[PDB]
Structures are given as structure tokens and as C-alpha cells.
Design a protein around this ligand. Structure first.
Ligand SMILES: [Fe+3]
Ligand SMILES: [Fe+3]
Ligand SMILES: [Fe+3]
Ligand SMILES: [Fe+3]
Ligand SMILES: [Fe+3]
Ligand SMILES: [Fe+3]
Lengths: 363, 361
């Protein structure tokens, strides 16, 4: 006997999967699978409009490229332009249908149902199409209604995924740019600030941290030197090496960074503040500003020390050429359990190729 | 016709996917569940690590209601992770009939299931009440509610993630904007309030809600370029001479240089505000003497909000101006310092500005 709630439970499962999925590619796949099962259709496609190239596009299969579609032509094109629904009982009798794809593969397209996708402001942003009704000779008025509800859900999900990626990007950008507010008085580069978080992301990941903490270290580590904004110019701009009085002030960039960052409530800022105050501490207990030792330094500060020293060593600094991989490796092995956490150093060494790769393509 | 509940689900999940507010997500989910389970009432209880209680919200948008995490039906399900299916609440010893008493309600059937996060921990309880057959929730109803519960878990975890990100993003922008705090007196609350005034101004001038959210977050960064000003200028313990003042004026250009290496709309706007905020509608400002609409609307809105905040704060010998005095100054400056059209909008809403100033001292 059949389950009367079968499709309902199937739809709820798809909706759970989709709500969890941040990648637009897979959202599109899951929406397509959903349509096929709910519409009882053999094939389904989503076409979205590209502002720049002036084309609709679709992904044909799992993992394959964007196929551009002519928005001025065909069935999807009609629906995209007019906002009207096309329900084709026989594709081979509609001059808007192209048989070439059909001609090559042994596939026979019979029925086509295409509806527009609308954004929140009722603009047409694409088309949702289904092909070859399996359990009836034609798509019905009821099928049209159902596909329109699916379209609304698809629209919302697609926009949400895009809005979220826009936010994610803006958040990174802001952290990167503001972290480099020191650019006028300190020579550390914008790419340095980015790369340090990227190396620390690998370390946290390979060290087995939760995906949330991996993401936080990537964004928190770049802020470690923000405290330099409060250092006097006579110290920060001194064209050589510091006296005791001056060095003592320079060290306070850690304390200052902490003061700038600690007033947050977010985990991001609590971790960033700790990194700011910890990143010159040594596994030894011989670092600054407090001589914290071993596990007294949060794992985030320990990961940032390794990443930051790595990136400095692999850049040219006046009087000293950037070190190559081999020397950097020997250095880290020698400083294991001294400057750096011995467990994290091993992880870092084991992933040293990914480190140099980031360094090479982000100059 | 069995497609009825599918169209209902699809309507609710569309609204859920748009919703940025946890409270509203929860209301949608409970309305979804009432319709799909054909039950009269539903509730979602979530756990607060801090207070060690469950909580729930009721409709109309009232306060969070604290619920005892140990005793009760919800309490039982949260602690044990077991499903609870009650045919008659008034015969169950764990039922608290006081909710019925105050509301005029008579609870009959209760079905309550756990909500789990991805990590697999129990984070709450989904409860459905008064199946509309006036009879028991069935094994098939339990099974349906297990699927609804997984969908609720996912959308709730997603909405919480989204709120964490938004809050972290604001925190970052606010804290780093105040990185000037060792060397400049502009306060943390000032930096926040200026975006909040510009947010009301943008809304009331009819910008898209996305742009309104952008101005709230972009305006706060407009003085970041002060970090590039030499100490012999910024910390000079005497009035600046003309040459030093020309250097000080470059904090606009410096802010632009810090911010402009973006691709995001937020940074593109923030960079414009950094470079424009001392420009004057009549073209007599700095650094470039831009005039009227040559100044982006975002820069024009920030100049109004930043001056407002400064007129309404006390300094030694210089008492904050009151509403009447501030209004008069803005009318005088219409078409001079400020965009006449925006000033009108700002003046129509000045009570909202004073309320912000009073709420965040
Ligand atoms: Fe450094
Ligand atoms: Fe440092
Ligand atoms: Fe560094
Ligand atoms: Fe200022
Ligand atoms: Fe300024
Ligand atoms: Fe200001």
C-alpha cells in the first residue's frame, strides 16, 4: 500500500538539504532533483540570467560547466522575456524547439513545461523548466500550479544563497581592508594580512577543529597587528632598531590590539582579541607580553604565530632575501617546542606545499 | 488535490528562505506545522545555554517566554531525547494546565519531538497540540513530524548562522572603525550613532532596504584615514597652522585609499563616504570642492548625521544644542553645507535622531 504523505516527506527532506547548502551549484542541482520527483518528470532545468554576458545559463549535469543559452530564442527564452507560462503538449510541433540535442543523444523530447522565476521585486530573473511528464501524456493545469509554487521556492532559495555569499564576501573584504589601515606607517602588505589567515585556516582544519572555528581563525588572524595604530610614530617609523624604552612601547601593540578588539560580543572578536594579545607569545614562555607558556596560549594564538612567522620568512625584508622552502623547513624543525607548538608545527610542516602554493599565487 | 499540502509547504519554505529574523522563522515553522499536521496549535522550544532554560516565543511579537528545562512535557523530551505522544493532557502528570487556565484553552492531544543540530546534540523540542480530528496523533503523524522536525532544525541552525555572521560583521566594522581611539577623541558610540542616523535618513529618503543597511555600516568607517595622519599633526598640543591643516584634510584621501581596494558594494560606498564627508553642497568643502550631486548621496547623508551628532554632544564650555537650536542651524545650512532635499527629510524625522542619541549615550 502507498504512503499518502510520500511526496510531502520527500519535499521536506529536499528542503532540509537545500537549507543546509551554501554552494549555488548544489542548490541548483537539488532544486532540479526536487522538481523531477514532485512533477513526475523525466528532466528539469533552471536557467538564470547573467547581467554581464547578456545570456541565460544553466548547468547541464553535476560538476560540468555553465552552458550559455540564447534568451532571445527557444522556449526558455520566451518565458524569460514575457513572464508567461509555456506548456507544450508536443515539442516536435513547436518551431521554438531545437532538436539538435535530441538528434545527437537518442533522446525524444515530448512535453515541456516552463515558468518564470521572479525576484522579490517581481523582476524576472530566470526560468524553471520540466521535460517529459512520466505519469500522464501532458502536463496539466494542476502541474502548472505546482510548478509555480516550486518556482517561488526556487527563487527564494537562489536569492538567499546569493545574498549570503554577498554578505560573506563583504565581511572578508572589510576585515582585510581595515586590517591594512596601518599601510601608511607600516610596511606589512595587504596580501600578508590575507595569507596569514589562509595559512591558519589550513592549520585549524588539519588540526581537526570544527568548521566554524576554522572559518573564524581565517578571519580573526588577519587582525593581529591592528594595535600598531596606537604606537607613536617615533617608534613605528624608526628606520632601524629600537632602544629599551622604544622596544617596550613597540611590544604594547599586542595590548593595544586587544583593547581595540575585546569590546565585541561575537566569537569572532573574542578570538581576534586573544590573537592580538598572544601572537608574540612563545611555546617557551620566553615571548611577550606576559611570557605565557604552552597551553596558556590559546590554540588560536599558537596557530597565528606559526602562520605569521612563516609568511615573514618567505618575503624579502631589507637586508634579507625571502627564504626558500628547505630553509624554512629546517627553521621550523629547529623551533619545534621552542617558539612554536610542537604538534601544530608538525601539522604545518606536513602541509607545507599548500602554504607555498598560497604564497605563490597571492604575491 | 493531494498536492494541497505540497503547495502549502512550498509557500511557507519560500517565506522561510527569505526571513532574516530568527523570531519570524520560528513563527513560520509553527504555522507550517499546524497546517501540515492539521493540528490547532504548535510550539518550538529552544535551549538557552546561559540561563539553563528552554524558551519559546508567542505570536504578535511579544517577549521570549522562559520554560523550565526539567519538568513539563517539553522538559521531558529535551532531557531524554524521547518522543512523547499524549492522548489526553489532563490525564498526564507532567502536564501543566495553567496555560489553558489563563488562555481559555483546553489542551487534549500533545505530540512533542526533539530537535537536533548537525553535531547531533538535542537543541530543543517541536510540539504539536490538538489534532483537528479530536483524536490521537497516529504513528503516521509521528513520522511526518520527524520530517518536519529535521526541516525545522536545518532552517533554525541556518537562521542562527546568519544572525552570527551579521552580528560579527557589525561588531568588526564598529570596533575597527574605533581603532583611532588611542590618538583621536571621537567615541565608539558616536561612530555607531552616525550610521544609525544615516540608516533612518536613507530609509525615509526612499532607498532600497539593501542600500539602507549598507549606509548603516558604511558611514561608521568614514574617518579611518586618521590612522595615516602624522602624530606631529594629530597629536599636536596646540592649534594647527595652515600647513598642518592641509595634512589633516588628507584623512579623507587616506580613508579612501584604505577602503577602495574592495569588490563589495559596502566598501565601494564606504570609500566614497571617507573621501566625500567634508564636501559641502555648495562646493566650498574639501578635499576637492565637489558640488551638489557630484557628491554621492551616501556622503551627503553622512555629513548631515555626523554634524547632528556633534551639535548634540556636550563639550567643556560648549553645552549640547537642543532640538530647537539644532533645527534652526540645519535650516540655515540648507543649500550651503547640506543637501536641501535631505535636510527636509532629516528635519521631518529629527525626533527619531534625538531618540537614538538618548538611547545610546
Ligand atoms: Fe607583525
Ligand atoms: Fe605583532
Ligand atoms: Fe604579520
Ligand atoms: Fe570626524
Ligand atoms: Fe573627517
Ligand atoms: Fe564623527
Amino acid at each position: 500500500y502507498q504512503d499518502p504523505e510520500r511526496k510531502l516527506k520527500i519535499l521536506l527532506d529536499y528542503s532540509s538539504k537545500i537549507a543546509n547548502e551554501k554552494d549555488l551549484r548544489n542548490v541548483l542541482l537539488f532544486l532540479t532533483d526536487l522538481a523531477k520527483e514532485i512533477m513526475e518528470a523525466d528532466r528539469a532545468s533552471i536557467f538564470l540570467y547573467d547581467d554581464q554576458k547578456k545570456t541565460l545559463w544553466t548547468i547541464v549535469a553535476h560538476g560540468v560547466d555553465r552552458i550559455e543559452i540564447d534568451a532571445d530564442k527557444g522556449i526558455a527564452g520566451y518565458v524569460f522575456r514575457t513572464g508567461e507560462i509555456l506548456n507544450i503538449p508536443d515539442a516536435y510541433k513547436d518551431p521554438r524547439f531545437d532538436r539538435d540535442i535530441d538528434k545527437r543523444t537518442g533522446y525524444r523530447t515530448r512535453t515541456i513545461l516552463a515558468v518564470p522565476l521572479f525576484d522579490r521585486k517581481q523582476n524576472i530573473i530566470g526560468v524553471f523548466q520540466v521535460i517529459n511528464k512520466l505519469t500522464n501524456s501532458v502536463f496539466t493545469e494542476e502541474d502548472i500550479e505546482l510548478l509555480r509554487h516550486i518556482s517561488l521556492y526556487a527563487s527564494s532559495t537562489i536569492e538567499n544563497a546569493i545574498l549570503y555569499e554577498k554578505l560573506k564576501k563583504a565581511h572578508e573584504d572589510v576585515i582585510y581592508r581595515l586590517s591594512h589601515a596601518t599601510k601608511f606607517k607600516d610596511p606589512e602588505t595587504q596580501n600578508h594580512i590575507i595569507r596569514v589567515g589562509l595559512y591558519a585556516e589550513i592549520l585549524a582544519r588539519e588540526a581537526g577543529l570544527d568548521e566554524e572555528d576554522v572559518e573564524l581563525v581565517k578571519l580573526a588572524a588577519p587582525m593581529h597587528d591592528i594595535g600598531k595604530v596606537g604606537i607613536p610614530d617615533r617608534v613605528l617609523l624608526k628606520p632601524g632598531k629600537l632602544n629599551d624604552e622604544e622596544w617596550e612601547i613597540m611590544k604594547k601593540h599586542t595590548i593595544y590590539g586587544y583593547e581595540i578588539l575585546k569590546g565585541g560580543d561575537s566569537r569572532l572578536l573574542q578570538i581576534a582579541a586573544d590573537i592580538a594579545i598572544e601572537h608574540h607569545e612563545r611555546w617557551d614562555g620566553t615571548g611577550y607580553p606576559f611570557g605565557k607558556k604552552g597551553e596558556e596560549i590559546s590554540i588560536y594564538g599558537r596557530m597565528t604565530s606559526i602562520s605569521d612567522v612563516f609568511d615573514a620568512l618567505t618575503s624579502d625584508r631589507p637586508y634579507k632575501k625571502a627564504w626558500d622552502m628547505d630553509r624554512t623547513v629546517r627553521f621550523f624543525k629547529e623551533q619545534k617546542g621552542k617558539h612554536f607548538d610542537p604538534f601544530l608545527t608538525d601539522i604545518f610542516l606536513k602541509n607545507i606545499d599548500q602554504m607555498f602554493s598560497i604564497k605563490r599565487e597571492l604575491r
